[PDB]
Amino acid sequence: ARMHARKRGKSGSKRPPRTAPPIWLEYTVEDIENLVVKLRKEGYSTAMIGTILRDQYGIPTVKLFRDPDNPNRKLTITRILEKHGLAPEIPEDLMFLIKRAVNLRKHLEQHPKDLHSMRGLQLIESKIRRLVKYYKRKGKLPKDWRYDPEQ
């Protein structure tokens, strides 16, 4: 169920089980990596790039091509960006939550009696702390990195 509201929505994607890319897809791996780099340099987020690739170029997920360099693994958008040095420094979902929290902290300065919007702030910060604990454990963040709202 939902983490805080305990609702039970079920909507999501229903991906068919396939191994090989479809026959009608004509792009090679070089074309797809060029497209991903170009879209990233236009400034889109990682989740948005895949949406554009699916909608406009007819490419179901890039997780259908084997990594040309490492045969053990398949290809993903963040891996493609890592191969060129355009990958984000902070993981994206943590960054989005931090951005949402900062905007809400300036709303609460002019509206100190808005107590219902403040619980939302507390829940957002709980999510942030869970994420930073996970990323510290895996080494994606330095040992000293800390979330301080006054920063």
Partner 1 sequence: TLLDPLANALSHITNSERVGKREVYIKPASKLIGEVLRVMQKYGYIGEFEFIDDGRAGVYRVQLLGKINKAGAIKPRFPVKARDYERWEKRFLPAFEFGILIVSTSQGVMSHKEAREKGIGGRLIAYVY
In the complex, the residues that contact RNA under the rule CB under 7 A are 3-4, 122-123, 126-127, 129-130, 133
Sign of CA dihedral 100, 13, 77, 143: positive
- Taking the complex as a whole, the smallest distance from the CB of residue 73 to RNA amounts, in Å, to 12
- Give the one entry of RNA, partner 1, none that residue 110 binds, where binding means its C-beta sits below a cut-off of 5 to 8 angstroms depending on kind: none
- Taking the complex as a whole, the smallest distance from the CB of residue 65 to partner 1 amounts, in Å, to 16
Query: Token pair of 102, please?
Result: 């900062």
CA atoms within 13 A on the CB side of 143: 0
- Taking the complex as a whole, the smallest distance from the CB of residue 31 to RNA amounts, in Å, to 30
Shortest CA distance to 83 belongs to which of 22, 35, 49, 33?
33
Counting residues that bind partner 1 (by CB under 8 A) gives: 4
Chain residues 3-32 in contact with partner 1, contact rule CB under 8 A = 15-18
Runs of H (alpha helix) within the chain:
29-41, 46-57, 77-82, 92-110, 115-138
- Taking the complex as a whole, the smallest distance from the CB of residue 3 to RNA amounts, in Å, to 7
Neighbouring C-beta atoms of residue 65, cutoff 10 Å: 19
- Give the one entry of RNA, partner 1, none that residue 63 binds, where binding means its C-beta sits below a cut-off of 5 to 8 angstroms depending on kind: none
Q: Can you give the binding site for partner 1, defined by CB under 8 A?
A: 15-18
